Design a binder for this molecule. Structure first.
Ligand SMILES: [Mn+2]
Ligand SMILES: [Mn+2]
Ligand SMILES: [Mn+2]
Ligand SMILES: [Mn+2]
Lengths: 196, 196, 196, 196
């Protein structure tokens, strides 16, 4: 069982950067749909599994990756934002940032470039590479979850699906990316980082 | 060279089914971006080709498929719609429809199911199978063009990228699909069909 | 768990078309590995599902598809071959082949083309489409199973992984394809066809 | 056009690690086919580009990637091997390997893992990342070229297509990988490394 997580703010807490209408639809509609479909897919897989039905398992697994990934991605995203967010990180996170990307600006520039460049719906990720021990930027198609498909540990995600910005910024993703920086919860990103 | 095609109507000609704001953005912004990037990609490929630079050719070819496909898909789409559209087809097209899908309703039902089911951005296609000589429904991811990636001849396309309906129907694709039936130019679809 | 099925004949029963060495390697080494790995992966997957670990499930997915498909594909393949095979089929399978492909020779020409044209490792597939009600030819990459990833019901499968012909026909697949027609078990393909 | 490069040594020069039969087949049959097909595809592509036929270009894409990559990958591979190869590298390539992987043995352990773990046909790739400035290991499906699809500059390539080891090591890739370390041309990998 999986559930739709309650936000730690209210829908309008991020205005004017991300309007309340987007936050409400994104949470109670889009994320809700992924959780519901995820639960369905996984009561189905559990019975395909019990019967040893390999064909059903494999047919199931675009559904499970899309909805399961949708749940994982959005669950992290909500925690990645805050009405008291914005600014720059401090401590080991900032030290690591300029160590792997040169500076906070270069990092910001590369993450923005990765998110805006996604063809179609997708996500832009700052991740941690456990093996190599360094920060890394990656982009995922649709709702493919970062860790499950790449191995990298997710620290910060920028959702570039049209439903995350279109009603407010239309076709101009650059404006969407430029605005979100003001509400990123660097306190949460650092927590994620330290746990690695 | 490729150019942005002039519409055969004005932006508001399809109201209330598809509002004027969507038609304007979709044409002068989204389609325009694909044509521009397409032309860039193909003056680049032409010089990669002249130098025998295989690596550059292969690096180029997500760009070319995405923007080139974007141009092809939208160019057909505009002709697929009409303010005098709607209703049902007549002649050999309707005969072929119920012959391959049972009835116009079953067909309509399956095409709607294919479009609404697309994970992420994509297109739903009624196509013609030259080899087998029958109608066929297919769905393509992002801007992958039907013929170039499937071999099927495109007859009718339903664009399910959020930029084609979100401002008006939000997350409810079913409402978007239900509305578009009233402005489909069956006269154009039949032309496409007869040419096969 | 799953099991390596016994072969319906001796390893050297398909000579000279497919030598005993290949049959022995293909069955007792390759197919056995898929079963063993399939079981290890399923056990795994059962643990991830119990804990609701979506990430573990999504990460497990390529291992399960590859091994699950390996087991499925090969299990069908063994029954598709016979020392008393060869020639053409009779009954309605034959009429269906005429109806959907023109003639038996056109069918084998197209199934051979789909098999030889597989880039890298893969399978050429005669299948049945329940939706349309007709036979259809498809090719699958590596060990992706026909039904699970396509919806088509498998009738006859041709394995074009190098481990199925390289020792005997080297770089020449056409020679392999040409030879295999002599050991096709049409009785089995007919049974599979009458079942759906 | 493109050309099948001559081999820097005789076909039996890598014995007993890679027998003459494989080397002869791999070079004069497989690589030659990629070059020939690459040239036919390019000529083609030149015609489609002249006419501005986007559909023909997009349809041509898998043929060109597969053959173009085949030619690129194999051309690098021949220079990566030598009768006087084997042992370890010296100079800064060695320090870079220590710095980015810990030790030479950890590097070969990881490059071997990436190569043996390739599902189906593919390549294991040592590469250099110009953006980050460090060595990196990557695996590519079938004939997809490293640079063109990844951005990484190729230094050392290990071919795991069955046609590169099956005749000699059958189903056991680890034996093949274990053997190949004896003929690696570190002089060439060093030159490729110093160039970028
Ligand atoms: Mn989202
Ligand atoms: Mn569109
Ligand atoms: Mn096989
Ligand atoms: Mn090779």
């Amino acid at each position: 069982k999986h559930s739709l997580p309650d936000l730690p703010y209210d829908y309008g807490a991020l205005e004017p950067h991300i309007n309340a209408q987007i936050m409400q639809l994104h949470h109670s509609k889009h994320h809700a749909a992924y959780v519901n479909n995820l639960n369905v897919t996984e009561e189905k897989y559990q019975e395909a599994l019990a019967k040893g039905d390999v064909t059903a398992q494999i047919a199931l697994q675009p559904a499970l990756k899309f909805n399961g990934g949708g749940h994982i991605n959005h669950s992290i995203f909500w925690t990645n934002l805050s009405p008291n967010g914005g600014g720059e990180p401090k401590g080991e996170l900032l030290e690591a940032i300029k160590r792997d990307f040169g500076s906070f600006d270069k990092f910001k520039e590369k993450l923005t470039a990765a998110s805006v460049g996604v063809q179609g719906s997708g996500w832009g990720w700052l991740g941690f590479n456990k093996e190599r021990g360094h920060l890394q930027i990656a982009a995922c198609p649709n709702q493919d979850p970062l860790q499950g498909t790449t191995g990298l540990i997710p620290l910060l995600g920028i959702d570039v699906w049209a439903h995350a910005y279109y009603l407010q910024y239309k076709n101009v993703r650059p404006d969407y990316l430029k605005a979100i920086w003001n509400v990123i919860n660097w306190e949460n990103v650092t927590e994620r980082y330290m746990a690695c």
